[PDB]
Coordinates of C-alpha atoms in Angstrom, one line a residue:
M1 CA 12.1 21.4 9.0
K2 CA 12.3 18.5 6.3
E3 CA 11.6 15.8 9.0
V4 CA 13.8 13.0 7.2
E5 CA 10.5 10.8 7.2
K6 CA 10.8 10.5 3.4
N7 CA 14.2 8.6 4.0
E8 CA 12.2 5.9 5.9
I9 CA 9.7 5.3 3.0
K10 CA 12.7 5.1 0.6
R11 CA 14.2 2.5 3.0
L12 CA 11.1 0.0 3.1
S13 CA 10.8 0.5 -0.7
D14 CA 14.5 -0.5 -1.2
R15 CA 13.7 -3.5 1.0
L16 CA 10.8 -4.9 -1.1
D17 CA 12.6 -3.8 -4.4
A18 CA 15.8 -5.8 -3.4
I19 CA 13.4 -8.7 -2.5
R20 CA 11.5 -8.8 -5.9
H21 CA 14.8 -8.4 -7.9
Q22 CA 16.3 -11.1 -5.8
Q23 CA 13.2 -13.1 -6.9
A24 CA 13.8 -12.0 -10.5
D25 CA 17.2 -13.9 -10.3
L26 CA 15.2 -16.7 -8.7
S27 CA 12.8 -18.8 -10.8
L28 CA 9.9 -20.8 -9.3
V29 CA 11.4 -23.8 -11.1
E30 CA 15.0 -23.6 -9.8
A31 CA 14.0 -22.2 -6.3
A32 CA 10.6 -23.9 -5.5
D33 CA 11.5 -23.1 -1.9
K34 CA 13.7 -19.9 -1.6
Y35 CA 11.5 -18.1 -4.2
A36 CA 8.4 -19.4 -2.3
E37 CA 9.6 -18.1 1.2
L38 CA 10.6 -14.7 -0.4
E39 CA 7.0 -14.6 -1.7
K40 CA 5.9 -15.1 2.0
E41 CA 8.4 -12.4 3.3
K42 CA 7.0 -10.2 0.6
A43 CA 3.3 -11.2 1.4
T44 CA 3.8 -10.1 5.1
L45 CA 5.9 -7.0 4.2
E46 CA 2.9 -6.0 2.1
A47 CA 0.1 -7.0 4.7
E48 CA 2.2 -4.9 7.3
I49 CA 2.9 -1.8 5.1
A50 CA -0.8 -2.0 3.9
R51 CA -2.2 -2.4 7.4
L52 CA -0.2 0.7 8.0
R53 CA -1.3 2.2 4.6
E54 CA -5.0 1.3 5.4
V55 CA -4.6 3.5 8.6
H56 CA -3.0 5.8 6.0
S57 CA -5.9 5.3 3.4
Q58 CA -8.9 5.6 5.8
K59 CA -6.8 8.5 7.1
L60 CA -5.1 9.1 3.7
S61 CA -2.9 11.7 5.4
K62 CA -3.4 14.1 8.3
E63 CA -4.0 17.2 6.1
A64 CA -5.7 15.3 3.3
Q65 CA -8.2 13.4 5.5
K66 CA -9.3 16.8 7.2
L67 CA -9.4 18.4 3.7
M68 CA -12.0 15.7 2.8
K69 CA -14.2 16.3 5.9
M70 CA -13.8 20.2 5.6
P71 CA -16.9 22.4 6.1
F72 CA -16.7 25.2 3.5
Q73 CA -15.0 24.1 0.2
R74 CA -15.0 23.8 -3.7
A75 CA -12.9 23.6 -6.9
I76 CA -12.1 27.2 -7.9
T77 CA -13.5 28.8 -11.2
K78 CA -11.1 30.7 -13.6
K79 CA -12.9 33.8 -12.2
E80 CA -11.5 33.3 -8.6
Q81 CA -8.3 31.9 -10.3
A82 CA -7.6 35.3 -11.8
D83 CA -8.4 36.8 -8.4
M84 CA -6.2 34.3 -6.4
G85 CA -4.6 37.1 -4.5
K86 CA -8.0 38.6 -3.3
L87 CA -9.4 35.1 -3.3
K88 CA -7.1 33.5 -0.7
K89 CA -6.8 36.6 1.7
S90 CA -10.6 37.2 2.2
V91 CA -11.1 33.5 3.2
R92 CA -8.3 34.4 5.8
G93 CA -5.9 31.8 4.3
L94 CA -7.7 29.3 2.0
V95 CA -6.2 25.9 1.2
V96 CA -5.7 25.3 -2.6
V97 CA -4.5 22.0 -4.4
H98 CA -3.6 21.8 -8.1
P99 CA -4.9 18.9 -10.4
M100 CA -1.8 18.2 -12.5
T101 CA 0.4 18.0 -9.3
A102 CA 0.9 14.4 -7.9
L103 CA -1.2 15.2 -4.8
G104 CA -4.1 16.4 -7.1
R105 CA -3.6 13.3 -9.4
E106 CA -3.7 10.9 -6.5
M107 CA -6.7 12.4 -4.5
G108 CA -8.5 12.3 -7.9
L109 CA -8.7 16.1 -8.6
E110 CA -9.2 17.0 -12.4
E111 CA -9.6 20.7 -11.4
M112 CA -7.9 23.3 -9.1
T113 CA -9.4 22.7 -5.7
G114 CA -9.9 24.8 -2.6
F115 CA -10.9 24.0 1.1
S116 CA -11.3 26.0 4.3
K117 CA -12.8 26.3 7.8
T118 CA -14.0 29.8 6.7
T119 CA -16.6 30.9 4.1
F120 CA -15.8 31.9 0.5

Protein backbone atom coordinates (compact mmCIF):
# COMPACT_ATOMS: atom_id res chain seq x y z
CA MET A 1 0.00 0.00 0.00
CA LYS A 2 3.08 2.27 0.78
CA GLU A 3 0.82 5.20 2.03
CA VAL A 4 3.24 8.07 0.85
CA GLU A 5 3.30 9.28 4.60
CA LYS A 6 7.14 8.91 4.61
CA ASN A 7 7.19 11.73 1.92
CA GLU A 8 5.54 14.09 4.49
CA ILE A 9 8.22 13.45 7.23
CA LYS A 10 10.89 14.08 4.51
CA ARG A 11 9.06 17.37 3.71
CA LEU A 12 9.08 18.85 7.32
CA SER A 13 12.70 17.59 7.73
CA ASP A 14 13.69 19.46 4.47
CA ARG A 15 11.94 22.52 5.98
CA LEU A 16 13.99 22.61 9.26
CA ASP A 17 17.23 21.49 7.44
CA ALA A 18 16.90 24.39 4.92
CA ILE A 19 16.24 26.70 7.96
CA ARG A 20 19.40 25.68 10.00
CA HIS A 21 21.62 25.79 6.79
CA GLN A 22 20.10 29.19 6.09
CA GLN A 23 21.24 30.04 9.69
CA ALA A 24 24.66 28.45 8.91
CA ASP A 25 25.12 31.18 6.27
CA LEU A 26 23.72 33.68 8.86
CA SER A 27 25.89 34.59 11.88
CA LEU A 28 24.43 35.91 15.17
CA VAL A 29 26.88 38.89 14.69
CA GLU A 30 25.87 39.87 11.09
CA ALA A 31 22.17 38.94 11.52
CA ALA A 32 21.27 39.75 15.20
CA ASP A 33 17.69 39.91 13.87
CA LYS A 34 17.16 37.58 10.82
CA TYR A 35 19.17 34.77 12.58
CA ALA A 36 17.15 35.46 15.80
CA GLU A 37 13.70 35.17 14.09
CA LEU A 38 14.79 32.02 12.24
CA GLU A 39 15.71 30.69 15.79
CA LYS A 40 12.05 31.56 16.71
CA GLU A 41 10.59 29.92 13.51
CA LYS A 42 12.78 26.94 14.41
CA ALA A 43 11.71 27.03 18.14
CA THR A 44 7.97 26.83 17.13
CA LEU A 45 8.55 24.30 14.30
CA GLU A 46 10.17 22.10 17.00
CA ALA A 47 7.51 22.80 19.80
CA GLU A 48 4.84 21.83 17.12
CA ILE A 49 6.53 18.71 15.64
CA ALA A 50 7.45 17.68 19.29
CA ARG A 51 3.87 18.28 20.60
CA LEU A 52 3.00 16.00 17.69
CA ARG A 53 5.95 13.63 18.50
CA GLU A 54 4.95 13.67 22.25
CA VAL A 55 1.56 12.31 21.09
CA HIS A 56 3.92 10.08 19.00
CA SER A 57 6.18 9.23 22.05
CA GLN A 58 3.52 8.61 24.77
CA LYS A 59 1.96 6.68 21.86
CA LEU A 60 5.42 6.00 20.20
CA SER A 61 3.56 4.44 17.27
CA LYS A 62 0.26 2.52 16.94
CA GLU A 63 1.82 -1.01 16.75
CA ALA A 64 4.74 -0.09 19.04
CA GLN A 65 2.61 1.36 21.89
CA LYS A 66 0.33 -1.83 21.81
CA LEU A 67 3.51 -4.07 21.70
CA MET A 68 4.53 -2.32 24.98
CA LYS A 69 1.13 -2.94 26.70
CA MET A 70 0.89 -6.57 25.23
CA PRO A 71 -0.34 -9.43 27.58
CA PHE A 72 1.85 -12.50 26.66
CA GLN A 73 5.46 -11.52 25.56
CA ARG A 74 9.31 -12.02 25.89
CA ALA A 75 12.68 -11.81 24.11
CA ILE A 76 13.20 -15.18 22.37
CA THR A 77 15.98 -17.67 23.38
CA LYS A 78 18.32 -19.22 20.66
CA LYS A 79 16.31 -22.42 21.43
CA GLU A 80 13.01 -20.93 20.07
CA GLN A 81 15.19 -18.96 17.54
CA ALA A 82 16.23 -22.28 15.90
CA ASP A 83 12.55 -23.31 16.08
CA MET A 84 11.22 -19.96 14.61
CA GLY A 85 9.02 -21.86 12.18
CA LYS A 86 7.30 -24.00 14.89
CA LEU A 87 7.68 -21.04 17.30
CA LYS A 88 5.62 -18.48 15.36
CA LYS A 89 2.84 -20.81 14.09
CA SER A 90 1.85 -22.36 17.48
CA VAL A 91 1.41 -18.83 19.00
CA ARG A 92 -0.97 -18.45 15.95
CA GLY A 93 1.09 -15.63 14.46
CA LEU A 94 3.57 -14.19 17.02
CA VAL A 95 5.12 -10.65 16.59
CA VAL A 96 8.99 -10.66 16.53
CA VAL A 97 11.32 -7.55 16.41
CA HIS A 98 15.14 -7.81 15.78
CA PRO A 99 17.67 -5.79 18.03
CA MET A 100 20.19 -4.63 15.33
CA THR A 101 17.36 -3.29 13.11
CA ALA A 102 16.56 0.46 13.61
CA LEU A 103 13.13 -0.30 15.22
CA GLY A 104 14.93 -2.60 17.72
CA ARG A 105 17.72 -0.02 18.27
CA GLU A 106 15.23 2.79 18.96
CA MET A 107 12.76 0.91 21.25
CA GLY A 108 15.97 -0.09 23.16
CA LEU A 109 16.00 -3.86 22.33
CA GLU A 110 19.48 -5.53 22.71
CA GLU A 111 17.90 -8.98 22.06
CA MET A 112 15.46 -10.55 19.54
CA THR A 113 12.06 -9.77 20.99
CA GLY A 114 8.57 -11.29 20.65
CA PHE A 115 5.02 -10.20 21.61
CA SER A 116 1.46 -11.58 21.27
CA LYS A 117 -2.16 -11.65 22.48
CA THR A 118 -1.76 -15.47 22.65
CA THR A 119 0.33 -17.73 24.97
CA PHE A 120 3.86 -19.05 24.10
